[PDB]
Amino acid sequence: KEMRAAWISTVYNLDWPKTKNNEAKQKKEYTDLLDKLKSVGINTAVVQVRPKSDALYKSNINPWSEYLTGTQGKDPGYDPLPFLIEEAHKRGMEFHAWFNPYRITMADESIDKLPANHPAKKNPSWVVKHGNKYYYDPGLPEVRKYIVDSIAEVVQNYDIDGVHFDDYFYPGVSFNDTATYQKYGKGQNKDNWRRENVNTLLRDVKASIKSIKPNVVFGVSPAGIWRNKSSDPTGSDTSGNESYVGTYADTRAWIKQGLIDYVVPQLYWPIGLKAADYSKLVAWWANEVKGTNVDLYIGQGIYKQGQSSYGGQNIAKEIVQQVTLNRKYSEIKGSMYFSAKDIANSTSIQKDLKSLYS
Ligand SMILES: [Cl-]
């Protein structure tokens, strides 16, 4: 059946939970949200279980997420994840656990204030500062193993249907990994080595998942441009930021090597936008997966509703037009909507999705 997913982001309490330190209210906020999503045809919840090197689940590896209580590491008095999963399943909805692999801190947060048992505190060798934030080093084999193991815990212990990574990889062109490169890089072009570091993580996460539960899917949602045609003649007829260059996310390699089961390019632009034309990009991405077994879903930017903050771009108003176009491409297998709150908070969006999905 067609994929009809919504992202439920927990970072900064974006979509869920609205309330901290109140188990009953958090539970009701979630079921009410699922009910509204189901009512418009959403069949899959993609829920951020690791927003910030943390866990919205009981873990022997990673600390409780601050977004449940206000305090990182604080036990909220229940494990939310069984509830999040079981309530999705009772409504006939699939559940994909979404992880951010490398993030550790937000801007200006002190690394020294993490909980004692935090992996980044126990393993200072793993941590790289970039600007005013800290990250796990994608180039360390121990870091990759730790991420694999962190996901494997969730696969083993919870009835998930999928594992999902979003679009954050290396945080910028530069990154203070010279020592890592010297030790492990074999003199390879450094940027190619960084791309391969990310590829290796994806490969190893997929393999781990399959060795436990073969039918659990693994997917990634990268940024919507891989390379512009101006950098690579087989790239897209677009301008602006490229995932290949800017975060070392080589989505084409992932597809060609079968490192993922599904891919969700974030096409958060209107049809006709010169720099990043939705209509050109759906075609480009459909062609990328042709002849592979990688499922293509389009990331839909319904959060853009004409605000000046987005230069007046209004994706929500044209969502029927976008999905109608998607459906012209047999390689496109559905959509993921950013984000759940936008569906919940808008009667117009609800009406449009009902008309697409009923
Ligand atoms: Cl290898």
Distance CA 76, CA 348 (A): 36
Distance CA 208, CA 121 (A): 25
Q: How far is the CA of 261 from the centre of ligand 1 (A)?
A: 19
Q: How far is the CA of 193 from the centre of ligand 1 (A)?
A: 12
Closest CA to 162 of 311, 312, 47, 32: 47
Distance CA 158, CA 174 (A): 37
Distance CA 144, CA 18 (A): 32
Q: How far is the CA of 199 from the centre of ligand 1 (A)?
A: 10
Distance CA 311, CA 288 (A): 29
Q: How far is the CA of 225 from the centre of ligand 1 (A)?
A: 27
Q: Is the dihedral of CA 31, 36, 38, 43 positive or negative?
A: negative
Q: How far is the CA of 318 from the centre of ligand 1 (A)?
A: 44
Q: How far is the CA of 201 from the centre of ligand 1 (A)?
A: 10
Q: How far is the CA of 204 from the centre of ligand 1 (A)?
A: 9
- Note whether 194 and 248 are within 8 A (CB): yes
Q: How far is the CA of 96 from the centre of ligand 1 (A)?
A: 27
Distance CA 43, CA 32 (A): 15
User: How large is the angle between the packed helices 190-212 and 141-157, nearest 10 degrees?
Assistant: 20
Q: How far is the CA of 264 from the centre of ligand 1 (A)?
A: 25
Distance CA 4, CA 160 (A): 17
Q: How far is the CA of 200 from the centre of ligand 1 (A)?
A: 7
Provide the pairing of β-strand 262-263 with 266-267.
unpaired
Q: How far is the CA of 197 from the centre of ligand 1 (A)?
A: 10
Q: Kindly state the tokens that stand for 95.
A: 């559940």
- Residue 20 CA: distances (Å) to CA of 24, 53, 82, 211: 10, 19, 18, 36
Q: How far is the CA of 224 from the centre of ligand 1 (A)?
A: 28
Tell me which amino acid residue 115 is.
P
- Note whether 66 and 72 are within 8 A (CB): yes
Q: How far is the CA of 98 from the centre of ligand 1 (A)?
A: 25
Q: How far is the CA of 174 from the centre of ligand 1 (A)?
A: 24
Task: State the SS3 of the chain.
Answer: CCEEEEEECCHHHCCCCCCCCCHHHHHHHHHHHHHHHHHCCCCEEEEEEECCCCECCCCCCCCECHHHHCCCCCCCCCCHHHHHHHHHHHCCCEEEEEECCCECCCCCCCHHHCCCCCHHHHCHHHEEEECCEEEECCCCHHHHHHHHHHHHHHHHHCCCCEEEECCCCCCCCCCCCHHHHHHHCCCCCHHHHHHHHHHHHHHHHHHHHHHHCCCCEEEECCECCCCECCCCCCCECCCCCCHHHHCCCCHHHHHHHCCCCEECCEECCCCCCCCCCHHHHHHHHHHHHCCCCCEEEEEECCCCECCHHHCCCECHHHHHHHHHHHCCCCCEEEEEECCHHHHHHCHHHHHHHHHHHC
Q: How far is the CA of 142 from the centre of ligand 1 (A)?
A: 13
- Across 133-162, b (16+ Cβ under 10 Å) vs e yields bbbbbbbbeebbebbbebbbbbbeebebbb
Q: How far is the CA of 279 from the centre of ligand 1 (A)?
A: 37
Distance CA 114, CA 104 (A): 10
Q: Please count the other Cβ atoms lying within 10 Å of the Cβ belonging to residue 75.
A: 12
- Note whether 242 and 227 are within 8 A (CB): yes
Cis omega (within 30 of 0) on the bond before 231? Answer: no
Q: What are phi and psi of 7, to 5 degrees?
A: -75, 135
Distance CA 258, CA 272 (A): 32
- Note whether 329 and 286 are within 8 A (CB): yes
Distance CA 358, CA 327 (A): 15
Cross-strand bridge partners of residue 266: 223, 299
Q: How far is the CA of 254 from the centre of ligand 1 (A)?
A: 15
Write down how long the chain is. Answer: 358
Q: Kindly state the tokens that stand for 352.
A: 């449009």
Q: How was this structure determined?
A: X-ray
Q: What is the experimental resolution, given in Å to one decimal place?
A: 1.4
Q: Kindly state the tokens that stand for 168.
A: 């954050």
Residue with the two structure tokens 């009410």: 32
Residue with the two structure tokens 């989505």: 251
CA 85 to centroid of chain Cα atoms? 18
